[PDB]
């Protein structure tokens, strides 16, 4: 419940080395869940 | 489909008592390899409709569904299927042909996704059992992989 607060934060992976977790999650999860829905959950700007 | 189940039951009976790398198991693998394209077609039928049931319940697909009655037009169905990127163009065309769209080109996705589930369950399970049996009793056969 608390970790739900960092998903959309611009600095989610600050200490963890993998800085592309959001990209990875969106690519596997997005077709079945919706790319825009995943981008909103992870605070990603698809255009940029 | 029930007749296919009976035939697969006969094949499993032929496999009764089979040993690893048994002659009858190897002959059955040869028969399946000889029928490769048709076996592939049957497996693709089962896989396509299982994936259809999985997709129709997905949030992304339901986003393309908008009509109050819950019916999706053929064109919205095509758009939704393309987005999921799990079916090919010919596969989506075949699904549209099977969809049984009404006079207004509206598909009842729930009925379409549940139509072939119960009828194909017995033969599907028996095919899974046959493949598992053959795989476990003919371990090093790249053709069965």
Distances (CA, A) of B64 to B59, B72, B81: 9, 8, 10
Q: At what angle do helices B89-98 and B74-84 cross, to 10 degrees?
A: 140
Q: Quick check: A37 contacting B, CB < 8 Å?
A: yes
Q: B79 vs chain A: nearest CA distance in angstroms?
A: 12
Cβ of B116: how many Cβ atoms within 10 Å? 19
**Burial, B124: exposed, middle or buried (Cβ in 10 Å; 0-12, 13-18, 19+)?**
buried
Residue B44 belongs to what H/E stretch? helix B36-56
**Cα(B86)–Cα(A32) distance, integer angstroms:** 9
Chain B residues with beta carbon closer than 8 angstroms to that of A37: 59-60
DSSP letter at B141? Answer: -
β-pairing, B106-108 vs B71-73, is: antiparallel
Instruction: Let me know: does B48 contact B40? Beta carbons within 8 Å.
Output: no
**Cα(B12)–Cα(B18) distance, integer angstroms:** 10
Instruction: Let me know: does B93 contact B81? Beta carbons within 8 Å.
Output: no
Give the resolution to one decimal, in Å: 2.4
Read off the tokens for B54.
């999985």
CA-based nearest residue to B91, from B101, B103, B78: B78
**Cα(B81)–Cα(B91) distance, integer angstroms:** 10
Phi then psi for residue B73, to 5 deg, are -65, 160
Provide the strand spans (E) within chain B.
Answer: 71-73, 106-108
A33–B83 CB contact, under 8 Å: no
DSSP letter at B105? Answer: S
Q: Which of B51, B57, B60, B81 to mutate to test the interface with A (most CBs of A within 10 A)?
A: B60
Q: Quick check: A20 contacting B, CB < 8 Å?
A: no
**Cα(B129)–Cα(B59) distance, integer angstroms:** 32
Instruction: Let me know: does B105 contact B73? Beta carbons within 8 Å.
Output: yes
Q: Quick check: A28 contacting B, CB < 8 Å?
A: no
């Amino acid at each position: 419940q608390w970790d739900r607060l960092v998903l959309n934060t611009p600095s989610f992976p600050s200490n963890y080395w993998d800085k592309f977790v959001k990209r990875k999650v969106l690519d596997k999860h997005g077709d079945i869940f919706g790319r825009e829905r995943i981008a909103e959950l992870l605070g990603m700007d698809l255009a940029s | 489909l029930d007749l296919q189940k009976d035939m697969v039951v006969m094949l499993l009976s032929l496999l009764e008592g089979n040993v690893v790398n048994g002659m009858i198991a190897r002959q059955m693998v040869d028969m399946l390899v000889e029928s490769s394209s048709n076996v592939e077609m049957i497996l693709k039928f089962f896989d396509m409709f299982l994936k259809l049931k999985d997709i129709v319940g997905s949030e992304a697909f339901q986003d393309y569904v908008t009509d109050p009655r819950g019916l999706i037009s053929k064109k919205d169905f095509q758009k939704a299927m393309d987005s999921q990127k799990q079916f090919t163009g010919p596969e989506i065309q075949f699904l549209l042909s099977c969809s049984e769209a009404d006079e207004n080109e509206m598909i009842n996705c729930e009925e379409f996704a549940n139509r072939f589930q119960e009828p194909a369950r017995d033969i599907g399970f028996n095919v899974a059992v046959l493949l598992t049996n053959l795989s476990e009793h003919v371990p090093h056969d790249p053709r069965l992989r």
